[PDB]
Amino acid sequence: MISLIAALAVDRVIGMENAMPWNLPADLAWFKRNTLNKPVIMGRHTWESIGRPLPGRKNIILSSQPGTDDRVTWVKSVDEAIAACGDVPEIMVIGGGRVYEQFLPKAQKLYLTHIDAEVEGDTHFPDYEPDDWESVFSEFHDADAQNSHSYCFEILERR
Ligand SMILES: NC(=O)c1ccc[n+]([C@@H]2O[C@H](COP(=O)([O-])OP(=O)(O)OC[C@H]3O[C@@H](n4cnc5c(N)ncnc54)[C@H](OP(=O)(O)O)[C@@H]3O)[C@@H](O)[C@H]2O)c1
Ligand SMILES: Nc1nc(=O)c2nc(CNc3ccc(C(=O)N[C@@H](CCC(=O)O)C(=O)O)cc3)cnc2[nH]1
Ligand SMILES: [Mn+2]
Ligand SMILES: [Mn+2]
Ligand SMILES: [Mn+2]
Numbered sequence: 001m002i003s004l005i006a007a008l009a010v011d012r013v014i015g016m017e018n019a020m021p022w023n024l025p026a027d028l029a030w031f032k033r034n035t036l037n038k039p040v041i042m043g044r045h046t047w048e049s050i051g052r053p054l055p056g057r058k059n060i061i062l063s064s065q066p067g068t069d070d071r072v073t074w075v076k077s078v079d080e081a082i083a084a085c086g087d088v089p090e091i092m093v094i095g096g097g098r099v100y101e102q103f104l105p106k107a108q109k110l111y112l113t114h115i116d117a118e119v120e121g122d123t124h125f126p127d128y129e130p131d132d133w134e135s136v137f138s139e140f141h142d143a144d145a146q147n148s149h150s151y152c153f154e155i156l157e158r159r
Helices: 025-035 044-050 078-084 097-106
Strands: 002-008 013-015 040-043 059-062 073-075 091-093 109-115 133-141 151-158
Touching: 002 013, 002 025, 002 097, 025 109, 025 151, 040 044, 040 097, 044 059, 059 078, 073 078, 078 097, 091 097
Parallel strands: 002 091, 002 109, 040 059, 040 091, 059 073
Antiparallel strands: 109 151, 133 151
């Protein structure tokens, strides 16, 4: 099974200048809980944005060019990325925009955080078709002293 996990600001913005400008510790904790002990697939730009391997997960990086760090696994196509995960119950695709576009048609589950924040971005989550997805979990949180925007955790499953 392939799942996508992402945090979306207003208008599906996910990034600006190869960074995420907000800071929502509760959402990073949600990301860790839902990805730990699973393989994670990311594109090369997201690898450079994170800046280090994510511990406790097999890190698989998509790039057309040879890898430059043997602490992670480098692959050259979608099918090779999936194969490099082995026989696991759930593969987590962690972006960025181009990678989400390619894996969305193959995904059965979306883990989405909707952040009530406006930022001027250059990368968006794919327009997906709402009729194709059933919301199976949603949990709203008001802003607090640690999390400066309200946010909504949602899990959607392909109908
Ligand atoms: N808010 C969130 O949830 C979230 C999550 C992840 C990322 N982000 C943000 O998203 C932005 C990065 O997204 P992005 O769309 O620019 O880049 P991306 O999807 O991270 O990376 C694209 C790169 O991945 C490689 N690639 C993708 N598909 C491939 C394929 N089929 N075969 C071979 N290589 C492939 C290519 O690398 P080569 O050029 O080396 O071939 C391509 O240039 C950043 O702003 C980051 O902060 C946000
Ligand atoms: N919901 C969601 N939020 C995100 O921030 C997110 N980020 C990415 C890509 N970028 C990043 C950037 C940093 C870390 C990170 O530092 N993760 C640590 C945090 C642990 C914690 O804060 O408790 C990790 O071990 O996962 C992960 C992904 C992909 N999907 C996401 N999905
Ligand atoms: Mn092929
Ligand atoms: Mn197999
Ligand atoms: Mn706000």
